[PDB]
Amino acid sequence: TTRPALLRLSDYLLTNYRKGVRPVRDWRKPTTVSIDVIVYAILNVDEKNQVLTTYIWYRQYWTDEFLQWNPEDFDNITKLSIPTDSIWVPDILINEFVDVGKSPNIPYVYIRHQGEVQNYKPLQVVTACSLDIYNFPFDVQNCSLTFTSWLHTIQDINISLWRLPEKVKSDRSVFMNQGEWELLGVLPYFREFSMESSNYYAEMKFYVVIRRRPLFYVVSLLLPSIFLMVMDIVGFYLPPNSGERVSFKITLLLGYSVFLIIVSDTLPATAIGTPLIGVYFVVCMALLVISLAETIFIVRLVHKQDLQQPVPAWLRHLVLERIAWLLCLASLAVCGLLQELSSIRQFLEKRDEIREVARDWLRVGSVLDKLLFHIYLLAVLAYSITLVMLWSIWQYA
Amino acid sequence: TTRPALLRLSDYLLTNYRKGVRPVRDWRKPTTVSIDVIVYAILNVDEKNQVLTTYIWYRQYWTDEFLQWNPEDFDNITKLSIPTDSIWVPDILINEFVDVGKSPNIPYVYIRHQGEVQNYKPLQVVTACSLDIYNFPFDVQNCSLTFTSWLHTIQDINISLWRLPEKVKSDRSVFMNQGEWELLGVLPYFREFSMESSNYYAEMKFYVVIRRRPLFYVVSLLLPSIFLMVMDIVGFYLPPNSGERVSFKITLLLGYSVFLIIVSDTLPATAIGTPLIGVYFVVCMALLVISLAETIFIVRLVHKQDLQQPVPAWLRHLVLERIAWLLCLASLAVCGLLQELSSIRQFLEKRDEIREVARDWLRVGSVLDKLLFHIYLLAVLAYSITLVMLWSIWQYA
Amino acid sequence: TTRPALLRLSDYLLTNYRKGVRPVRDWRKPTTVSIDVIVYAILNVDEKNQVLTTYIWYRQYWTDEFLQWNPEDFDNITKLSIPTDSIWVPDILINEFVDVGKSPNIPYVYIRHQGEVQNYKPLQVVTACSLDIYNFPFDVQNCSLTFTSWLHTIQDINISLWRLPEKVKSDRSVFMNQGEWELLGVLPYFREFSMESSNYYAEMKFYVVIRRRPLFYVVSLLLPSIFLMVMDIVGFYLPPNSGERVSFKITLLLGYSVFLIIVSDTLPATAIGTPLIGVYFVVCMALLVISLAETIFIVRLVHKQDLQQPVPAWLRHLVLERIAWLLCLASLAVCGLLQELSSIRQFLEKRDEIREVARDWLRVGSVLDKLLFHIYLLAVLAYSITLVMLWSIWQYA
Amino acid sequence: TTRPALLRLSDYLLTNYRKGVRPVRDWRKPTTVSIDVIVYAILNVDEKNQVLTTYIWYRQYWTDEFLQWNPEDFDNITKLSIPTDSIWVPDILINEFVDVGKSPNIPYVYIRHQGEVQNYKPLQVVTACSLDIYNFPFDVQNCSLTFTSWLHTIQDINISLWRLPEKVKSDRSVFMNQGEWELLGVLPYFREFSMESSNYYAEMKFYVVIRRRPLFYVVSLLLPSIFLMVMDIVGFYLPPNSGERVSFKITLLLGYSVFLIIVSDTLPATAIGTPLIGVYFVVCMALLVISLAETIFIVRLVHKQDLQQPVPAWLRHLVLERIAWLLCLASLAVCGLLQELSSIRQFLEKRDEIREVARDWLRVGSVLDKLLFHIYLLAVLAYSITLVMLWSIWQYA
Amino acid sequence: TTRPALLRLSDYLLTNYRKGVRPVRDWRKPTTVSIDVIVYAILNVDEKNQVLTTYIWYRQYWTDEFLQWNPEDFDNITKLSIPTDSIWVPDILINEFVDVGKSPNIPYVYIRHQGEVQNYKPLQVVTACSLDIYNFPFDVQNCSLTFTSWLHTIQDINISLWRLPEKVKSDRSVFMNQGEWELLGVLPYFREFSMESSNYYAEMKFYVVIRRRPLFYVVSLLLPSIFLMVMDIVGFYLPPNSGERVSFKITLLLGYSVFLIIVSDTLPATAIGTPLIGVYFVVCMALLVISLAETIFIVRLVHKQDLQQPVPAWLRHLVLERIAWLLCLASLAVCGLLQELSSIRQFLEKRDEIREVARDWLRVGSVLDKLLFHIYLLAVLAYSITLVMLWSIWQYA
Numbered sequence A, B, C, D, E: 001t002t003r004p005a006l007l008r009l010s011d012y013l014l015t016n017y018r019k020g021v022r023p024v025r026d027w028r029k030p031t032t033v034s035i036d037v038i039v040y041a042i043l044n045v046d047e048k049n050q051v052l053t054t055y056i057w058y059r060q061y062w063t064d065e066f067l068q069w070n071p072e073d074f075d076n077i078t079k080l081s082i083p084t085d086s087i088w089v090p091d092i093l094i095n096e097f098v099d100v101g102k103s104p105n106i107p108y109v110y111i112r113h114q115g116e117v118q119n120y121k122p123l124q125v126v127t128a129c130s131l132d133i134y135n136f137p138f139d140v141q142n143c144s145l146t147f148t149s150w151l152h153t154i155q156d157i158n159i160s161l162w163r164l165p166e167k168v169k170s171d172r173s174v175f176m177n178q179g180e181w182e183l184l185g186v187l188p189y190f191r192e193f194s195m196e197s198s199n200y201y202a203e204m205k206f207y208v209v210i211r212r213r214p215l216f217y218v219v220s221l222l223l224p225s226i227f228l229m230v231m232d233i234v235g236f237y238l239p240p241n242s243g244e245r246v247s248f249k250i251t252l253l254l255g256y257s258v259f260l261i262i263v264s265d266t267l268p269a270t271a272i273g274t275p276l277i278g279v280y281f282v283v284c285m286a287l288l289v290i291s292l293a294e295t296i297f298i299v300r301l302v303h304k305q306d307l308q309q310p311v312p313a314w315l316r317h318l319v320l321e322r323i324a325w326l327l328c329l330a331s332l333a334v335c336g337l338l339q340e341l342s343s344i345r346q347f348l349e350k351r352d353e354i355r356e357v358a359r360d361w362l363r364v365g366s367v368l369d370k371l372l373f374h375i376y377l378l379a380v381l382a383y384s385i386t387l388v389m390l391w392s393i394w395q396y397a
């Protein structure tokens, strides 16, 4: 024939084709759409809004009973490319859609002589799923993509898998693995959904399992916390008499509060439940408050010298003997002169006695400060070891 | 017939069909559109802009008097799928629209032999409603969706419900319940709206009632507040003489002010009215200011020792007797020597008297500090109990 | 006739209709477009960018001389609905456009037998206007919407009002009154604009007058300011000798500076002129600086005791008499003993004299501190009363 | 003729017209497009991304040799409106495009009997240019708009100006002058651009010169700076012995650092070069650091009294004579008594000598503090005067 | 011929042309698309999301075997412009697409008599690549653009380069060089990609190498750091007895922590690895912590005077001899009088001895403070020199 083979075949196919008619000679035969999903990247995970944005390479093929031809009559053409906007295309969508992502339009599809139509197209899908951040930053999310025909029931359109389920499960060839999220697998699952008495719908659920990389968050959260805790430990060495100890502790607490406020404003959160990491921040705040309370108690005990109250005997024993051991620690004119110089005696006696009372109070305060510093340091060490053990469990288990 | 049944039926229907003509043989008969609304998710609630963004699964069916056929003449076809862009579609819109949401296009609709046309399509609707945050974070919003034909009057297009009102009221099958907002119900209501003398319009109002989950806000707001209040309580134990008490209190107040500024910058607000939660922040600020004023008063009273003024007798009685009980608390040369050593007497007398005056002032200040600390602690406890009772009322009522 | 009346009428009208031809039999006759504007909501007012975003319900009608028919020939059809995309539509736009808002498309328009065409459509219009914030937060903005035919001159398209000007002026039926902005009126005004010698253009200017609700801003700005001013007033009671007064004042000033920086970063501003509210912040900062300067002066005066300089007589009189009244306030060995004990006399004399000089300086400083505190309190009260009077004028005038 | 003149003319013109053919009878004749640009507003200037967003009223006219008619044959019609989407339109674009702005579509164009086609359309153009902020906030930007035919070479499409260059240069009729940027002029310039051997392209470059209004930035930057500098000046009056001077200075420096960090986070910047205004901030920081260093030096000099080191004679002379002038400032028992009371002599001697050494050190420190305060105040005054002179030069030159 | 040459040629070409058929007479012959890429600007580099946004001037040409004509039959027309939407266009896309950028549409393409079709069009491409910020701010990114036919295999569409690889490699004519990123080169590379047994795909990978300009980041990060380090150095001069040293150091540390938090919130970061610049911030924080620990140790050593413990002999030797050298530093009544005045002796003895013990402790503390200040200054100088050497290596290597 004079005309080119491709042109003649396209004229033979599309001159009598109806775009709005489902391609089945017998209307009782459903149109089976075999789909495949390849996850490319996790563009954004919005735990606040429970919205997942991901980019996939979606492809589907079905049988077009009207687009069939004999290759021998068209120069042995067995495969042909036809515009997408000139043939019937199933209305396969995702139930979890909450927004329309902007994706490039694929103008052509492949068609084979026996009727198979191959449609490859990438999709930016904005889907809402359950983003539980209880184990944040070690959370593993399980978001599902439910591909289903929005209108046509299973008696018209049914859905199946292009490849074997195992291959889809472990398909990670083109995934952007350098991002915050690691793709564990894509689990397919078929279900015949229904709400009406006979309106049964075909669904293919792809469970996109993604695991967060916690090292960035672990650093950005722990490092300031351990720095402030170390500074708190160092602050104990300041003598209680200097007075700068209270200012140091309160300034450190203010800095920690500012840091925690910033962290809360920056970290993700969900209204249904708070992450477990927030408990550790509360524990650190409690430790800092305990340190400041101990500092205030020691300061008050030292200033009790201003009470002019001799140290009780029982406290003396308890602190300086038990705890200290535990811590490994003209005659008439002359007689008038005598009487007055004894008044001087009595006044200097009183001043020296006040000084010695302050001495005793200060010694007791220092001993108790050493004891409480040791106790607080041991508690902090135990808490740090417990946290490290939890991290090791999450790391190696 | 040689041609496929679906192709022949589509040709028989759409070859003479006019897309821009309302499908009624008699123009006096209105076209009744039975709609249904299923709320899927509350994407965003903007109290600042009074804008609500939600995703719904909207579906409507009407009768197309031109798209009727006899099944026996088309291989017993009783249901057919036809492209949406090839048939008349009512211009049902929402009055509350302030923006166009991006929603996937459904290319096909279902058509039955007797003329019924079924159109399923999801809609991201950006609607403006009254978001009163007076009871924030326990606010229950009542936003209405008014589906109405923008142009056609009731003499042309009328609207009704697909399902019974009760089923629509309690339809929560696919709602995303893990979000910040909980769906209480969707109340439908029909109204024949009108502004002109004869331009009566059909309206179907769906009242989307959503309740906020307050636990997240409750925690994020109370926990810093109770932490700072506890720190304020601890600060009372600092002795007034140390001087660090004033610095502690002012630093705590500065931290609370910064926290409140951040909270205001982060919490939602409306220009028509402030939330009731802002009163509790003002109460906490007043409590902190009262604490600082008491600290300043005690500091001034203690420093009154620098006034060299003996304590008044009435104040002495009132504080050290009533309140304290309530709180369960060569001759000529020798005579010259005598005269001078008595001058020494008088100077040490004066110094000791000054010290004793300071003693009395300090004792009075300490007693009053204990009293005011007890009073402030009782007031704080009462306020906390009242707040807890209010929360319990909001929780169990 | 066998065919339906609506179908026959649509065929009779649109089969010979040209969409791109202005509908006038005589080209010398202009096409008069009667428009109407109903403001629905003020979505956003951007004082920084001088951009106004509002949602309106715009509707226009004109006469289509080609779309005329005799009702008696079409089953007494006097009103018909025709797709918008099948008839000529005027290119009415707003000159103030700076952006294209996304608005739902209305597919149908109403047509009557005598030629009138009714087009209802909502519009999200992003327009630039003069947003003067001089009276912020009590500013009343006056933004104009100039509807005009972009291309056609007045010899082709002319514009008029659908309703009477009074009704348009007071049309507030569907306005969202719960927002930050209150709609005072929509004033229409017609003008025959021109730039060329004969290119006269029809314009219809709608002056959208909106008034801001200041209560939210009034609270969010005054409450921190009055709180900090009250704290400054309380700080005067701290004795100058404690030394904590300077730290208190400087910390308060730092907090106020941080608050003012945040307020400036959050409040709207224009490069052409600053709001009058900024003057009051400067006044408050000046008051705080004056308070700190007075505190520093009193501290220096008290520490002048370290100068070992007796108080000048004139200052003594002025402060302790005038101002205080205003404020309602072996012989040789024995003689050697005598000589030395008189050396002791002289040393204790000097120490006591130094103490008394410090006494006098402290008394003078305290009296002057009381005076300056009274003066500053009176000035603050006067400023607050003036501000309250200004607010009352803005409220009741 | 029975048909309307406009309808008949449109049928005569557009029935044989090809939309995709350049309108020239002789293909060797280029199509000359006369353009005009009117700047309406400067929507956004992004110095960070080097992106300029502006709104212009662009209009162009060319000759359509196929759309010609004799007015006498069509009821003396000399001007006609035709849809834009039905005639050939040149592909004039801007080379500097980096984004597509959303602009309203103009559906109609004017056509005259001799072939001229007038196309008016507004354009929101997002263009990238060189935004040098070296003279910020007094920077004058010079951004170019290069209108050129993307595909057609000069042998097909050539570009010229609608109006005279002078009129375009001074066209400021509709510019929004209330914004941050002031339009100085729009300079046109034609160039025959080329890269290949014969692919010469016509370009029309419009140089949009815009000048920033600096008053807002000048205030928002200077006022905090001068306030903090004044506070630093006041801080010198605090006596060095009080100890609050160091806390005051360090708190002021912390506040200035926070302010500078916020300013840097808010002010625009470019990676190619920093603005000159940053030098003045560095100078202010250096001044504050010098003030704090002087305060620390004076504090150390005063505390040298704790060194028990008498003031060197040379320092005494230099400070208290030169600089001070510049600043305008039983026998055995009795002998035992004698020996011991002389031991008392020696101890009180030592205490008084220590006090006098502290006296001398304090006097020297006070004199040097006065000197350095005068020097620092003079330096600050000189810097402020220099800055004011620079501002006056930028204002009046 | 009467008709215009261009019109006649367009009619001859496009009247029988099929838009959806690949232009090859023999379907076995692949369509070779020669592409070219010119990078215009780097709009945005998102290290957080691993997304690159760039603007390129993409152009491709291929052979259209159906659009061929003899110039002599059409008035010697050798080149023609035809609308893009009227001819077959290959579906060349970028694999790395994650979003659709908005780019102007080019309506026309050039066609030559022998069949070559030239298509010029700009593209805003949003592509995901590996943005390693390990060497930040001196990082050199290597992002690839893989142009490939999405559907057609290599047996249908193959891709080649328009120009020589060297010219494409060094094409920087129109690049916006004033931005944050500098373009080093664009390296092309061809690959026959494949996943199936016979589905081989043609790919052309352009490696866009961009280098960041670090001067802005270098300044904005170092200048605050060096300022705070200098302030820390100055703080050592404060005497330990003043007590303001601890407050100064803790305030400086708080300021540095706030600065570091802001820097972290502003600087880019990746979850796969932290930048090396973060180590230097940790080193600076460690230096500040060491300085504060030294200050606390010196303060405690000085306050040890409150321990009433004479300085150990070994410490005395070590500090005041070795280190100091290294640093280049009636009888009965009279006898009663005697006994009591000797009691006075003993009390003043004790007071003076306490004073001398404090003297010794203070001298030791001052000497050790000088030593540790010298050591810390030397360490800081060494660290600064090492950092400067690293910068010089990065600058000149």
Ligand SMILES: *[C@@H]1O[C@H](CO)[C@@H](O[C@@H]2O[C@H](CO)[C@@H](O)[C@H](O)[C@H]2NC(C)=O)[C@H](O)[C@H]1NC(C)=O
Binding pocket: B030, B154, B158, B159, B160, B161, B190, B202
């Ligand atoms: C428009 O439709 C509504 C809903 O079907 C009609 O309202 C119903 O009218 C019937 C008959 O009068 C009543 O029995 C129902 O109780 C009504 N339902 C409701 C919810 O009001 C309405 O009459 C229709 N109007 C027109 C003009 O057709």
Ligand SMILES: *[C@@H]1O[C@H](CO)[C@@H](O[C@@H]2O[C@H](CO)[C@@H](O)[C@H](O)[C@H]2NC(C)=O)[C@H](O)[C@H]1NC(C)=O
Binding pocket: C030, C154, C158, C159, C160, C161, C190, C202
């Ligand atoms: C364009 O329309 C306006 C509005 O209808 C016309 O203005 C009116 O003109 C009539 C007759 O001259 C007056 O009686 C009215 O008072 C005018 N109204 C206003 C608001 O000005 C205007 O004349 C029309 N112009 C043309 C050229 O048709």
